[PDB]
Paper text:
The RNA polymerase complex of [name], like other nsNSV members, consists of the large protein (L) and a co-factor protein, the [name] (P; or VP35 in the case of the filoviruses)4. The P protein consists of an N-terminal domain (NTD), central oligomerization domain (OD) and C-terminal X domain (XD).
In addition to this L–P structure with one L–P copy bound with CD′ of the second copy, another main class (class 2) of particles lacking density for the second CD domain was reconstructed to a 3.3 Å resolution structure representing the monomeric L–P complex. Since these two structures show nearly the same arrangement except for the second CD domain, we used the 2.7 Å structure for further analysis.
Numbering used by the authors:
A (entry chain A): 266 to 609, 638 to 892
B (entry chain A): 1809 to 1856
C (entry chain C): 435 to 471
D (entry chain A): 10 to 24
E (entry chain A): 1182 to 1291, 1300 to 1692, 1707 to 1711
F (entry chain A): 1037 to 1084
G (entry chain B): 539 to 603
H (entry chain D): 435 to 475
Write the structure that this text describes.
């Protein structure tokens, strides 16, 4: 670590702001160095090639860098980790926040959003139909398991196949192969209301201590008066959510649902949504998170709660609806699945061989990935059917499709108090040109909004891509990060290497199917930044390797600061946070004795 | 003594006396959630 | 003979109406996924 | 007097 | 020193395993024990009313807790109703009907972080067979003690092999004993602790519907309330006698085993779930120690044939002999991973001894008694269950079944489906299913009606089929999950303090 | 007047011959005091 | 026909050569064998010699166990 | 007479079924091309 | 007898199919794209 710091810190003078590109590329380098140890000969150094190509491109991107540095610096970065154990290589994920953070800007942040939120996409109708069929099948199977095999209230169409009608009458399960096969019987399906919308699941979601964007009439009140040429409107309306909630003369949860059902959201003339730069992200340009007005924020949080509480539990691949123990156990089982558990015409002559429990065992090969700008690639066509299905389930209409119809005719601005506009007088928001930090008429989604529906659609797409060729997979998906273990039955008389080489063929054959499915749904599975492994997969920024979790001990030690997370300077809270940080470091792979002494 | 047929037969034929028993035990004998223990099955069958 | 041909002619109509129902459902799904609020 | 306001001790804002 | 009288936990680690990278298939590999999966506390709720507002459920929870803790007499119920009327306006009778009975686990309440990096516990084999403390009851929970001890042993083995790459040359066995003489203390309990103060200044000024719920039930009629009251009085475990409680334990155990098999069949990576370690809780050990063998086996056979009824009917499999052969050919053809629960529960020394004393199982499948093959024991139990159920059905004794679900109407639909499957099985068994009506593309209600008509016609026309009885089922509907019913039966068993059922010239 | 009612309820719960500070805590959590505390706990910083 | 996340095709480009050197250095062979492989890889006429060297190294790795 | 009319009716019904199948097949294989955002100008 | 029943039933089914076709035409004619 000391050598790594010494090597990288030399780049800051010569390479001013591009150093954070290398600092971000550090983690893919660790993943590649771990990947170069797997048994399969094709997967050795397959991601390291792309990582090194990216580093060479970075190091040959300027005249100062060319005449002061060279591509030989990649060798210096690499040589400090060659011939080292797995734990030492995997430990450098704790070196993420120890290099500082880059200086952000509003125009640079909005340029990428404009670039990747204005493009027109081509979608396949059949693929969406099959994904919807898998969606309905998973819901039906979940309700069956929950209520002991009884189907939920369903009204099949007239053109339903005899197999589906027989399954409904007999109250039997449906496999995804049947769902893809008889996918035309799910086209006109129509659920009935069996879940009652509860508006009092959590009373504290309407009073979160957050900030709200001002109404569109006075949008520039975010910038302080010290940075604006003119003077803002004298109307004194609070932008924080707490005071707005306190000063609400009329309020009942029914009105939020009535607002989102009765068509009011599209007729509101005072709706404003504004981005805000994200802190402590060391990408060369920081991330963005959006905030809306009061009513729309309440509607959004209600929709998220409704979708997550009830429908989310029907899927077994959601990581956001499982407790600590259940999620840990499932992840450990999936990781262990990656290692074999047993090393070793006349007068037809047959010899009795001592078969060992059918002589076939299941082994899996792992594929972990994240999509390119997951939130920006969605469209209304992709999610309209699933929103309608959820509406039918809940007995209401057009609540879960509130995002795109509202956003398609709105303007977004990156609101930073120290990046004011150059206006001399107040100007209506929709009058500024399509440049600077304005996004006009967006199409895609927003980071952190209706993410549960996107997760369900992604799970359905993964299952369709698996069924499309015949392989079997088990997945774990949260937002963008998805880890899929492709399982295959192989003879148990073989050896380790041959079994792994057998499963690698299924993985490389399923990767193209997943790419085609995601391209059909409008997304794009980037070809060179997908982690195919035989032992490891990454989830929640942690690596699972042959059933064991590689340690990250120094990350919980780097946050043992004196005045740590204290509202006011007090000894009790600081000592509590120190003890918590040291306990976390101990349970991440630090020695208990030295951890206690250092604490 | 694998199954203990010798022990039971000798107990039946010869005089009754205390019998000390030893047998092999390896990694295969372990069960998923059961303590490692050994006892002749044939002796149990004969006794019952 | 006559009864058999009548039964076959009747049975063709169920297939035709199933095709019509499938077309209607396809158009309905297209309308749902295309038309805005 | 409201003298219970302390300046922030850790980074919590973008640079 | 203790002569084996001191409870302990047994932990074992093999000899020559490379901890770092497993380049060879390891037979001792297993999923570690991350802690007890705590069950939801919302499962202890009677599903009489389809939709209830949150204040009503809060009042029900308050009444449940108060009656569990401070007594269950009439005065305690009046005080609980007085306190619960703050959040919902429930009549005393409706509250008495709708509040379940609480246990120790209900009160015991307690991004994601791993408990520890898992290094050498993938191979550790652990057992609590020799560990048991008598002080456990409903007042004091002892699952936490067991969880703490297993986790501490796991952490000790994790720390010992922290800096060495290989496991070693010899197997490592460790006993985790406890110092029960000082720390472990028996707890007394006085159930009736009357209050001293009096609720006098409590008013009811609140009116918001999300804070207060006046008239919590709207759609419920008076006839519906009377029906619900009668049904609740029917299944009240308090007024049942000992034999009924033991029978309920056995029926719930059989249903749990069957449902676990059915749900575990679907799962993809089942072979890896079966090797996973877990605590002795929710492992059915205690009821297996205190259930009735004959009723459990008969119910298991009935559940098996009920599951296979439609497949038997579609294939026209007739006769008491061909059905058994087909069922067991199917059972042996499929993966043996689905028998995990039964195979594990039958391996306990006390469970195996109790089953063996009755002649159902004998130590025949291996050289040593303590390591009998699990799959063979499970198949033998299944064979005995099927044979017993079919022989008893032909002999003419009814079958008792419990249908448990959290919703009443779903429970009724499940009862109808169960009756339809049983009628299909009866048609198969009586060797009259070859000429029966076709049951393709029909709902279960239509199948039930058609099979009822066919069976009545065949019985009336021909008087040979006397052993075939349509009303051979006694189905009891419960408005809760099966786990809640089993726990309630076990709790009443412990409270009543009734022992489990226990069952010369030839010697000389 | 919520404070007086809360103290009186807690005293009625605990002022008995045996004190159970956990059952009373659960009952208060399920009562109005639980939602009162949940709502009032949204402000956690001195600045806000 | 090019490389992707699924496979590494040995070629003569600088990134591929660096990746091959790194994967040879991280192998579990003897130090002399790794050094000899590195020197033999540094002198390659075209992609065919690189592919042959990679095949030989893969065979040696397989036979190492 | 009867056979001739049966054959003719079968032929016309087959033609109608073929047309319906053509319509269904052409509907199913559809590429949906969404429009692009930005300032209307 | 039988012929009249055949005529009535066939005419009724043909009219029902024609009504369904007209409904389909009306439904497609209401698409916002068209
Ligand atoms: Mg992303
Ligand atoms: Zn000991
Ligand atoms: Zn002590």
């Amino acid at each position: 670590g000391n050598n790594l710091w010494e090597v990288i810190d030399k780049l800051f003078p010569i390479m001013g702001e591009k150093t954070f590109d290398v600092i971000s590329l550090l983690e893919p380098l660790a993943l590649s160095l771990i990947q170069t140890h797997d048994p399969v000969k094709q997967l050795r150094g397959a991601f390291l090639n792309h990582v090194l190509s990216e580093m060479e491109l970075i190091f040959e991107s300027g005249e100062s860098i060319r005449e002061f540095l060279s591509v030989d610096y990649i060798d210096k970065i690499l040589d400090i980790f060659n011939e080292s154990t797995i734990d030492e290589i995997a430990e450098i994920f704790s070196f993420f926040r120890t290099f500082g953070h880059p200086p952000l800007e509003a125009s640079i942040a909005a340029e990428k959003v404009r670039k990747y939120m204005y493009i027109e996409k081509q979608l396949k109708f059949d693929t969406v139909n099959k994904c919807h069929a898998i969606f309905c099948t998973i819901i039906i199977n979940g309700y069956r398991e929950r209520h002991g095999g009884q189907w939920p209230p369903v009204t099949l169409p007239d053109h339903a196949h005899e197999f589906i009608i027989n399954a409904y009458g007999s109250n039997s399960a449906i496999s995804y192969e049947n769902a893809v096969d008889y996918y035309q019987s799910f086209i006109g399906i129509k659920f009935n209301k069996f879940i009652e919308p509860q508006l009092d699941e959590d009373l504290t979601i309407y009073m979160k201590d957050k900030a709200l964007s001002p109404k569109k009439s006075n949008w520039d009140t975010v910038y302080p008066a010290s940075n604006l040429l003119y003077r803002t409107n004298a109307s004194n309306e609070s932008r924080r959510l707490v005071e707005v909630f306190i000063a609400d003369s009329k309020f009942d949860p029914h009105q939020i649902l009535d607002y989102v059902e009765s068509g009011d959201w599209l007729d509101d003339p005072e709706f404003n949504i504004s981005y805000s730069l994200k802190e402590k992200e060391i990408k060369q340009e920081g991330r963005l998170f959006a905030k809306m007005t009061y009513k729309m924020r309440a509607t959004q949080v209600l929709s998220e709660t409704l979708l997550a509480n009830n429908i989310g539990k029907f899927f077994q691949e959601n990581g956001m609806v499982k407790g600590e123990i259940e999620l840990l156990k499932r992840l450990t089982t999936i990781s262990i699945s990656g290692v074999p558990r047993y090393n070793e015409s006349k007068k037809f002559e047959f010899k009795s061989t001592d078969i060992y429990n059918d002589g076939y065992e299941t082994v899996s090969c792992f594929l972990t990935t994240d999509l390119k700008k997951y939130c920006l690639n969605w469209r209304y066509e992709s999610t309209a059917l699933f929103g309608e299905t959820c509406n039918q389930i809940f007995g209401l209409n057009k609540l879960f499709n509130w995002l795109h119809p509202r956003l398609e005719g709105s303007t977004i601005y990156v609101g930073d108090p120290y990046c004011p506009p150059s206006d001399k007088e107040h100007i209506s928001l929709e009058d500024h040109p399509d440049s600077g930090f304005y996004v006009h008429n967006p199409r895609g989604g927003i980071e952190g909004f209706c993410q549960k529906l996107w997760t369900l659609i992604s799970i359905s797409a993964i299952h369709l891509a698996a069924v499309r060729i015949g392989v079997r997979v088990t997945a774990m998906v949260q937002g963008d990060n998805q880890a899929i273990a492709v399982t295959t039955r192989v003879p148990n008389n073989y050896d380790y290497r041959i079994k792994k080489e057998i499963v690698y063929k299924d993985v490389v054959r399923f990767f193209d199917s997943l790419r085609e499915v995601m391209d059909d749904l409008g997304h794009e599975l980037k070809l060179n930044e997908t982690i195919i492994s035989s032992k490891m997969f990454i989830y929640s920024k942690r690596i699972y390797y042959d059933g064991r979790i590689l340690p990250q001990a120094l990350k919980a030690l780097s946050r043992c600061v004196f005045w740590s997370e204290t509202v006011i300077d007090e000894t009790r809270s600081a000592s509590s946070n120190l003890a918590t940080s040291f306990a976390k470091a101990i349970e991440n792979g630090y020695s208990p004795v030295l951890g206690y002494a250092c604490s | 003594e694998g199954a203990g047929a010798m022990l039971a037969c000798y107990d039946a034929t010869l005089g009754p006396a205390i019998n000390y028993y030893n047998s092999g035990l390896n990694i295969t004998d372990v069960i998923g959630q059961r303590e490692l223990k050994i006892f002749p099955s044939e002796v149990s069958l004969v006794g019952k | 003979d006559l009864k058999k041909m009548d039964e076959s002619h009747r049975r063709l109509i169920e297939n035709q109406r199933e095709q019509l129902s499938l077309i209607t459902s396809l158009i309905s799904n297209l309308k749902i996924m295309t038309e805005r609020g | 007097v409201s003298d219970i306001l302390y300046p922030e001790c850790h980074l919590n804002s973008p640079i | 020193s203790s002569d084996g009288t001191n409870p302990y936990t047994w932990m074992y680690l093999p000899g020559n395993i490379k901890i770092g990278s497993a380049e060879t298939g390891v037979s001792s590999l297993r999923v570690p024990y991350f802690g007890s999966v705590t069950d939801e506390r919302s499962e202890a709720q009677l599903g009489y009313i389809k939709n209830l507002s949150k204040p009503a459920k809060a009042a029900i929870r308050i009444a449940m807790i108060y009656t569990w803790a401070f007594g269950n007499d009439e005065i305690s119920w009046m005080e609980a109703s007085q306190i619960a009327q703050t959040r919902a306006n429930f009549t005393l009778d409706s509250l008495k009907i709708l509040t379940p009975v609480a246990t120790s686990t209900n009160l015991s309440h307690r991004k994601f972080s791993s408990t520890s990096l898992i290094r050498v516990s993938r191979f550790i084999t652990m057992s609590n067979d020799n560990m048991s403390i008598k002080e456990a009851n409903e007042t004091k929970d002892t699952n936490l003690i067991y969880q703490q001890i297993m986790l501490t042993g796991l952490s000790v083995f994790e720390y010992l092999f922290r800096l060495k790459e290989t496991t070693g040359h010899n197997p490592i066995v460790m006993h985790l004993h406890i110092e029960d003489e000082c720390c472990i203390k028996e707890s007394f309990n006085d159930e009736h602790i009357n209050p001293e103060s009096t609720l006098e200044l409590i008013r009811y000024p609140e009116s918001n519907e999300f804070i207060y719920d006046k008239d919590p039930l709207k759609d419920v009629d008076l006839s519906k309330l009377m029906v619900i009251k009668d049904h609740s009085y029917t299944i009240d475990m308090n007024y049942w006698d000992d034999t009924d409680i033991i029978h309920a334990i056995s029926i719930c155990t059989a249903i749990t085993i069957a449902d676990t098999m059915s749900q575990l069949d679907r799962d993809n990576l089942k072979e890896i779930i079966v090797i996973a370690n877990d605590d002795d809780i929710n492992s059915l050990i205690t009821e297996f120690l205190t259930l009735d063998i004959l009723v459990f086996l008969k119910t298991f056979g009935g559940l098996l044939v009920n599951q296979f009824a439609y497949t038997l009917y579609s294939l026209k499999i007739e006769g008491r002999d061909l059905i058994w052969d087909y069922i067991m050919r199917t059972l042996r053809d499929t993966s043996h991973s689905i028998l995990k629960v039964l195979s594990n529960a039958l391996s306990h020394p006390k469970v195996f001894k109790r089953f063996w004393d009755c002649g159902v199982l004998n130590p025949i499948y291996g050289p040593n008694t303590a390591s009998q093959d699990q799959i063979k024991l499970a198949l033998s139990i299944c064979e005995y269950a099927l044979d017993l159920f079919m022989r008893e059905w032909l002999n003419g004794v009814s079958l008792e079944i419990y249908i448990c679900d959290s919703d009443m109407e779903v429970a009724n639909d499940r009862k109808q489906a169960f009756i339809s499957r049983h009628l299909s099985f009866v048609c198969c068994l009586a060797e009259i299913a070859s000429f029966g009506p076709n049951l393709l593309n029909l709902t279960y209600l239509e199948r039930l009606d058609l099979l009822k008509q066919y069976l009545e016609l065949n019985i009336k026309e021909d008087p040979t089929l006397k052993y075939v009885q349509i009303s051979g089922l006694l189905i009891k509907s419960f408005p809760s999950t099966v786990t809640y019913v089993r726990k309630t039966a076990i709790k009443y068993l412990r409270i009543r303090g009734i022992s489990p059922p226990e069952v010369n010239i030839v010697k000389t | 007047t919520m404070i007086e009612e809360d103290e009186e309820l807690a005293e009625f719960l605990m002022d008995r011959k045996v004190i159970l500070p956990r059952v009373a805590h659960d009952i208060l959590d399920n009562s109005l005091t639980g939602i009162r505390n949940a709502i009032a706990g949204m402000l956690d910083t001195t600045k806000s | 026909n090019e490389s992707n996340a699924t496979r590494l095709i040995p070629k003569k480009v600088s990134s591929t050569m660096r990746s091959l050197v790194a994967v040879i250095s991280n192998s579990n062979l003897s130090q002399s064998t790794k050094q000899s492989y590195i020197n033999e890889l540094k002198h390659c006429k075209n992609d065919e010699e690189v592919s042959e060297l990679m095949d030989m190294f893969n065979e040696d790795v397989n036979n190492c166990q």
